[PDB]
Amino acid sequence: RTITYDVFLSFRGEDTRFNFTDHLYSALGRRGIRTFRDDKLRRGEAIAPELLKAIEESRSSVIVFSENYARSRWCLDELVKIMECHKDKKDPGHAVFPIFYHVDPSHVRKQEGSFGEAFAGYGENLKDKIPRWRTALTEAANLSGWPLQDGYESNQIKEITDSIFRRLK
Numbered sequence: 257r258t259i260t261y262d263v264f265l266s267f268r269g270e271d272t273r274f275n276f277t278d279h280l281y282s283a284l285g286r287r288g289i290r291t292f293r294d295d296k297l298r299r300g301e302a303i304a305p306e307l308l309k310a311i312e313e314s315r316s317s318v319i320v321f322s323e324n325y326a327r328s329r330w331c332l333d334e335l336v337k338i339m340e341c342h343k344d345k346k347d348p349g350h351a352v353f354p355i356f357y358h359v360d361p362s363h364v365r366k367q368e369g370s371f372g373e374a375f376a377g378y379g380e381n382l383k384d385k386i387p388r389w390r391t392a393l394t395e396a397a398n399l400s401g402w403p404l405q406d407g408y409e410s411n412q413i414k415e416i417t418d419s420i421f422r423r424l425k
């Protein structure tokens with residue numbers, strides 16, 4: 257099985273592109289963890305084939321759940337693909353590491369709060385994806401990860417990246 261990246265970074269750009277996810281990306285690189293972090297402007301109807309391919313060629317995914325993650329149908333389609341690989345891929349598997357960035361993990365797990373609010377903005381053309389999206393969020397939120405709240409963020413990122421390093425080896 258081809259492996260190009262150690263980590264695929266899933267995130268909601270409008271929330272975290274310039275700040276937390278950028279600092280996390282550079283911290284992973286400083287540990288020699290080959291990371292895919294999209295910085296292209298995406299305006300296609302569907303998920304870009306470059307992204308689907310990067311997920312398939314990653315040893316793991318890190319998910320930066322943030323307040324508006326579920327308001328993007330592209331983030332949710334990304335998550336479904338990640339959780340599909342988590343179930344199917346082998347030699348090696350595809351590990352998943354969720355970060356709950358200033359969001360309650362149970363809100364992700366149960367689609368409450370802003371994660372429940374998000375689904376009201378999806379019309380009937382997405383009706384068939386909504387059950388898969390909910391399933392992927394619940395599965396992801398049950399995996400062991402890191403709830404982040406207010407506190408010194410450089411030390412938060414240091415502990416996360418140290419933990420990913422030890423779990424990949």
Ligand SMILES: Nc1ncnc2c1ncn2[C@@H]1O[C@H](COP(=O)(O)O)[C@@H](O)[C@H]1OP(=O)(O)O
Pocket residue numbers: 268269270271298299300301302328330
């Ligand atoms: N084709 C697309 N692919 C991925 N994300 C998109 C796409 N179109 C819109 N988005 C996301 O939805 C937001 C609102 O778009 P618009 O105002 O044009 O309706 C964009 O800033 C972007 O959020 P993000 O940058 O967090 O990925």
